[PDB]
Amino acid sequence: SLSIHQLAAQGELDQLKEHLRKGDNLVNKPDERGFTPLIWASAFGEIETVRFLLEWGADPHILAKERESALSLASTGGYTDIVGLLLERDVDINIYDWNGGTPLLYAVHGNHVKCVEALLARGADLTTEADSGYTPMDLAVALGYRKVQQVIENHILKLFQSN
């Protein structure tokens, strides 16, 4: 009697598959906050559920009511492999939510070094100030996250060279 969102959240994949039997638009049904089964699975790091949902027709681009995305929820949790699966479907990497974040800013804020590296490698923007007045490097510096700062630096040096 758990909802599809809870089944996704808890990695109850056999039950989720049975529930999605019909292969209809259930896979993208938003809950009361606009969260899809994919956004719940991403938030809780349930990679095999994410993989199945994408294969079954889940739309990774859907934003919840306050502009939360599967990508941002994966980034705040440090789920680098989920981030990668989502980036493969060409989701917007610079999604600005109403909480004042972006995927990169959540990866920085969580000191998720490999997540930061993944997002940068796919071309996440560094040049833009968040609503709070912080660029991603500004935030890494303020938080004292030196490993994140280094990954940002490595990337920035590559950007002013075209050859």
Binding site: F35, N99, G100, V108
Partner: peptide, 16 residues
């Protein structure tokens, strides 16, 4: 067993 909603943190909490 009900898991809490997906949440995004306040990224400038405690900062200037």
């Amino acid at each position: 067993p009900l898991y809490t909603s997906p949440s995004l943190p306040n990224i400038t909490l405690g900062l200037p």
